[PDB]
């Protein structure tokens, strides 16, 4: 899991119900609907390679053989970059083993 | 949608395939598997009320009547806070209308 959390299922509450929430240290507090709780549980397992790109072009090597998706996105940024992707052939690689015991 | 993005479905690629990615401005670049692309599409619609809590206790009022979930979490923080939640009754409220035309 990407980080630890505590989940209170508060069930059905009427608009205007006030939650009084106590905490021992700086942490995030998020009140959400059931649909959004389902989204949250998905994002606990969300993994990817990359991050903020400040130079161009960049190269990223695919780590394992499988179906891959590349996202360019403006999360935390003012706008969406124009982008292009060129798929370069893998270098030949040997598969390693352990040393003979 | 929480932010704009561009999605390249690169299909099946062998380990070691190198993606050369060009961008016009600072943006995020994320290479991910199909399962993780499904998670990503969920997080484009992820909405909640709250944020980083620096005082305690805090109060959050439920905005609409429905099934609610409260998350306390350590995303971006060193550790998970101890927490408690007390559910306080809603204040009586009138429903407003428009002024008579």
Q: Do the bridges between strand B49-53 and strand A83-88 make them parallel or antiparallel, or are there none, so unpaired?
A: unpaired
Sketch the domain layout of chain B as residue ranges.
Answer: 1-101
For residue A39, which phi and psi values (nearest 5 degrees)? Answer: -60, -50
- Sign of the dihedral defined by the CA atoms of residues B77, A5, A68, A97, in that order: positive
Backbone angles phi, psi at B52, to 5 degrees: -80, 125
Q: How big is chain B by its Cα radius of gyration, in Å?
A: 22
Residues with Cβ < 8 Å from B29, sequence gap 6 or more? A50, A51, A53, A58, A60, A70, A71, A72, B21, B23
How crowded is residue B31: how many other Cβ atoms within 10 Å of its Cβ? 22
Cα A58–chain centre separation: 20
Q: Which two tokens stand for residue B80?
A: 């998970």
Say if the Cβ atoms of B46 and A43 lie within 8 Å.
yes
Instruction: Provide the shortest C-alpha distance from residue B100 to chain A (in Å).
Output: 26
Distances (CA, A) of B100 to B25, B53, B94, B95: 51, 42, 17, 15
Strands A58-61, A18-23: pairing kind: unpaired
Residue A18 to residue B62, Cβ atoms within 8 A: yes
> How many cross-chain Cβ pairs, A to B, lie less than 8 Å apart?
416
Q: Is B69 close to A33, i.e. CB distance below 8 A?
A: yes
Instruction: Read off the tokens for A23.
Output: 């905490």
Buried/exposed code over A22-49 (b: 16+ C-beta within 10 A; e: otherwise): ebeebbbbbbbbeebbebbbbeeebebb
Domain A1-101 class in CATH: few secondary structures
Asked if A60 and B24 come within 8 Å (Cβ–Cβ), the reply is no
d(CA A49, CA A88): 17
The torsion angles phi and psi of B12, rounded to 5 degrees, stand at: -80, 125
The whole-angstrom separation of Cα B67 and Cα A32 is: 9
Q: Which technique was used to obtain these atomic coordinates? A: X-ray
With beta carbons less than 8 A apart as the criterion, state whether B26 and A77 touch. yes
Distances (CA, A) of B38 to A39, B5, B44, B61, B67: 10, 14, 10, 32, 24
Q: Estimate the share of chain A in helix, then strand, then coil, as percent rounded to the nearest 5.
A: 10, 45, 45
DSSP-derived letter for residue B45 is S
Give chain A's length.
101
Cβ contact A53–B27 (<8 Å): yes
Spatial separation of the C-alpha atoms in residues B16 and B7, rounded to whole Å? 21
Unique residue bearing structure tokens 């606990």: A44
Q: Which residues from B are below 8 Å from A73, CB to CB?
A: 3-6, 27-28, 30
């Amino acid at each position: 899991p990407n980080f630890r959390y505590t989940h209170y299922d508060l069930k059905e509450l009427r608009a205007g119900t006030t939650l009084e929430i106590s905490l021992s240290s700086v942490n995030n507090v998020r009140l959400m609907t059931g649909a959004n709780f389902q989204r949250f549980t998905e994002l606990l397992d969300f993994k990817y390679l990359g991050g903020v790109a400040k130079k161009s072009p960049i190269r990223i090597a695919v780590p394992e053989t499988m179906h891959w998706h590349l996202i360019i996105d403006a999360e935390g940024h003012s706008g969406l970059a124009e982008s292009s992707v060129k798929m370069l052939p893998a270098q030949p690689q040997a598969t390693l083993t352990r040393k003979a015991s």
